[PDB]
Amino acid sequence: LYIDETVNSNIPTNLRVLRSILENLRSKIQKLESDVSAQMEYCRTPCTVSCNIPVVSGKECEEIIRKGGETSEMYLIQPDSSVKPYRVYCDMNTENGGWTVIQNRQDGSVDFGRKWDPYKQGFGNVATNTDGKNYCGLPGEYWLGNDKISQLTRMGPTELLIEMEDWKGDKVKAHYGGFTVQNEANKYQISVNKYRGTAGNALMDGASQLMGENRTMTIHNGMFFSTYDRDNDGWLTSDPRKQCSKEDGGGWWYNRCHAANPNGRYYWGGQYTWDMAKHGTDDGVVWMNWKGSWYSMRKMSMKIRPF
Amino acid sequence: IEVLKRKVIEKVQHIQLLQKNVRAQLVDMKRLEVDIDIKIRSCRGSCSRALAREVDLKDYEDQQKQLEQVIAKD
Amino acid sequence: GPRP
Amino acid sequence: GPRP
Amino acid sequence: EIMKYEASILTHDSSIRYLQEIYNSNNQKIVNLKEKVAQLEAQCQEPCKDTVQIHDITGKDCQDIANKGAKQSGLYFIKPLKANQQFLVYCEIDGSGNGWTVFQKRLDGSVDFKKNWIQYKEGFGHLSPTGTTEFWLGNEKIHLISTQSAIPYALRVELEDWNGRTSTADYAMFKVGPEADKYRLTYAYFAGGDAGDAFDGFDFGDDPSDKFFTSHNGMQFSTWDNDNDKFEGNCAEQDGSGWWMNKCHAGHLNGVYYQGGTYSKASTPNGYDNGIIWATWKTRWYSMKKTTMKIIPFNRLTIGE
Ligand SMILES: *[C@H]1O[C@H](CO)[C@@H](O)[C@H](O)[C@H]1NC(C)=O
Ligand SMILES: [Ca+2]
Numbered sequence: 001l002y003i004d005e006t007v008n009s010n011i012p013t014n015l016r017v018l019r020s021i022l023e024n025l026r027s028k029i030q031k032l033e034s035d036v037s038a039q040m041e042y043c044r045t046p047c048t049v050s051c052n053i054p055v056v057s058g059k060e061c062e063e064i065i066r067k068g069g070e071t072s073e074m075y076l077i078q079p080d081s082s083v084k085p086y087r088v089y090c091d092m093n094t095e096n097g098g099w100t101v102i103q104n105r106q107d108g109s110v111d112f113g114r115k116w117d118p119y120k121q122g123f124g125n126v127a128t129n130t131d132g133k134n135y136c137g138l139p140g141e142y143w144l145g146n147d148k149i150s151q152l153t154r155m156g157p158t159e160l161l162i163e164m165e166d167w168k169g170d171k172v173k174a175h176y177g178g179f180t181v182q183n184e185a186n187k188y189q190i191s192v193n194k195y196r197g198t199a200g201n202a203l204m205d206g207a208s209q210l211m212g213e214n215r216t217m218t219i220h221n222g223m224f225f226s227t228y229d230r231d232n233d234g235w236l237t238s239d240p241r242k243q244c245s246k247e248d249g250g251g252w253w254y255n256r257c258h259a260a261n262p263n264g265r266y267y268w269g270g271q272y273t274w275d276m277a278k279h280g281t282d283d284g285v286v287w288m289n290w291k292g293s294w295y296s297m298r299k300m301s302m303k304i305r306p307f
Numbered sequence: 308i309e310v311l312k313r314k315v316i317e318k319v320q321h322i323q324l325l326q327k328n329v330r331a332q333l334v335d336m337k338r339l340e341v342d343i344d345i346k347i348r349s350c351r352g353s354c355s356r357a358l359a360r361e362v363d364l365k366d367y368e369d370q371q372k373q374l375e376q377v378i379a380k381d
Numbered sequence: 382g383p384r385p
Numbered sequence: 386g387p388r389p
Numbered sequence: 390e391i392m393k394y395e396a397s398i399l400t401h402d403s404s405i406r407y408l409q410e411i412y413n414s415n416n417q418k419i420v421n422l423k424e425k426v427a428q429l430e431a432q433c434q435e436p437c438k439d440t441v442q443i444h445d446i447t448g449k450d451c452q453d454i455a456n457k458g459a460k461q462s463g464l465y466f467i468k469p470l471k472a473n474q475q476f477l478v479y480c481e482i483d484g485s486g487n488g489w490t491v492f493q494k495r496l497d498g499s500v501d502f503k504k505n506w507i508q509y510k511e512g513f514g515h516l517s518p519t520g521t522t523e524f525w526l527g528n529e530k531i532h533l534i535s536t537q538s539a540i541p542y543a544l545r546v547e548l549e550d551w552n553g554r555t556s557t558a559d560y561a562m563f564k565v566g567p568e569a570d571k572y573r574l575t576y577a578y579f580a581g582g583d584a585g586d587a588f589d590g591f592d593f594g595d596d597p598s599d600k601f602f603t604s605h606n607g608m609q610f611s612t613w614d615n616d617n618d619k620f621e622g623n624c625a626e627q628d629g630s631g632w633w634m635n636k637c638h639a640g641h642l643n644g645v646y647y648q649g650g651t652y653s654k655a656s657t658p659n660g661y662d663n664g665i666i667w668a669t670w671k672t673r674w675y676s677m678k679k680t681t682m683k684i685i686p687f688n689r690l691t692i693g694e
């Protein structure tokens with residue numbers, strides 16, 4: 001009988017708490033409405049720089065630390081003089097120095113969610129002038145072209161030091177004394193071995209806190225490079241809306257899909273959750289085997305070396 | 308004359324509609340947020356300056372807590 | 382992570 | 386310069 | 390009876406419809422705000438713009454390229470006749486048609502020239518686009534670009550005091566010997582410039598040999614820890630530097646860059662002179678500010694054409 005009381009009682013806990021959040025969210029469709037111009041505007045004008053190319057060059061950061069190159073910064077390395085030179089950032093302090101940065105993370109600045117080329121050629125800022133000293137001694141997020149990599153790794157057996165530190169300070173790395181990025185012909189295929197390290201061999205050993213069919217399909221080794229227009233994912237779905245790169249924001253060696261997601265979306269604070277992501281997948285600067293599919297660390301660089 | 312509980316059970320089953328609908332709303336902007344905010348940082352290197360804002364998921368993911376109690380009316 |  |  | 394009025398307390402009929410409205414707008418609005426981003430991301434798809442840039446043409450030396458086109462005193466990859474890796478040089482073209490090339494410059498005290506041997510060879514510091522930027526291209530590179538097939542080069546010790554007036558000083562078939570012999574510089578004769586010839590020695594009084602011991606012409610290159618000078622030790626280190634020492638010097642450029650110039654026997658680490666001197670212009674205590682040094686082909690010194 002009584003139900004005719006939902007009118008002025010049961011209902012009076014809806015519209016009030018409906019028109020409310022449809023509104024307290026309305027005043028969101030605002031902030032997240034202008035800012036998209038309050039920063040789209042201050043975009044009208046690009047950012048400039050001036051990387052005074054130091055005197056000392058080399059074939060790559062290794063030969064340079066062997067030519068007096070001791071301060072870590074913007075260098076000009078020239079692998080096989082059968083290809084146009086190019087700037088880069090060297091690491092000449094952390095571990096014998098001479099590490100040629102290949103990718104770097106420490107802020108947003110550079111979106112990695114691009115297509116083929118940008119990944120093949122190279123995108124980002126290969127460091128920027130150190131507010132005072134006329135040279136670019138501090139690294140800036142970027143992804144030194146693929147070719148350049150697929151090539152610098154071709155200088156015989158090439159080491160690779162993927163390091164990282166998480167927001168609460170802690171830090172670990174993962175060295176792959178055996179790393180090679182195949183030619184853009186084998187869809188940049190990635191071969192890696194001799195994994196030493198404390199970060200957890202998430203590229204070879206696959207993601208740990210999982211199992212078989214679930215683990216192994218988080219194997220980055222043997223993997224092709226894939227983008228959101230270059231589908232070579234380990235995931236084989238006859239559907240175009242489903243792809244390990246269209247999701248998991250940013251190209252990378254995807255094997256249905258990842259255990260490590262460098263070049264991912266940039267998540268502030270580390271922890272993030274599906275109810276945030278463009279597609280609900282764990283797309284972010286993630287290294288599952290260490291912090292978990294839901295911790296998107298602060299900085300994560302991939303700097304390599306010959307020998 | 309009928310005492311119709313019709314224009315009730317109905318004009319109340321609607322609440323249930325635009326209740327599930329909004330839950331998507333309050334979640335389309337809990338992502339449009341995150342996507343917008345992250346895509347903004349996506350310029351501090353392709354654009355000059357950038358603004359240092361916030362987002363708060365203690366509020367965005369708070370409005371959700373209530374819109375998740377307001378369930379049960381039959 | 383992996384997929385279903 | 387000049388020394389002994 | 391009366392409560393049949395419910396068709397009155399039934400106002401939600403539209404007290405709700407005004408939501409199935411404001412709602413229907415937001416999402417709809419989003420189809421718009423989902424372009425108001427699709428376009429911004431693309432506006433943020435490039436890198437910061439960089440000033441420094443490498444030009445297209447390249448050849449023998451700055452002078453070769455500076456005569457294949459050119460006109461912009463900039464940086465070009467040069468690969469000397471009998472050379473190797475086309476390292477980068479900081480040229481300087483005029484209006485005539487002659488392309489110079491520094492090999493050492495000083496302007497502020499931003500490159501602590503006091504690097505060890507293997508650094509003075511491969512050079513250290515940093516080039517740049519314009520010019521202002523202390524740098525030592527490095528004797529190594531200074532060699533292959535001073536003996537390509539052997540055609541007369543020359544140094545023009547350009548300078549400037551801590552008071553405006555700049556000098557300059559030239560030399561013949563300038564040439565820095567291969568690391569083998571060391572880096573012993575070999576110029577034939579002095580050729581002008583009121584800069585004062587301090588490579589021809591200078592008598593400081595201390596002893597009649599102040600002049601023979603502080604002559605730099607044909608004096609192997611000494612580093613703080615690899616000195617082939619004519620001393621009973623390393624002048625370089627004794628003064629902390631890497632010049633072309635003897636027993637010791639007069640005309641210290643790779644030396645202690647001083648704020649103001651004129652220094653004293655107090656800052657002198659070990660005591661003697663080590664600043665930016667040139668006895669044939671200023672004394673051993675007065676250091677300079679500006680202080681380049683640049684090669685160039687000789688058959689273009691008094692070209693007229
Ligand atoms: C992985 O697949 C599903 C993921 O939801 C899970 O139910 C299953 O137990 C897992 N299989 C193994 C053995 O890893
Ligand atoms: Ca596929």
Ligand SMILES: [Ca+2]
Binds near residue numbers: 616620621
């Ligand atoms: Ca000696």
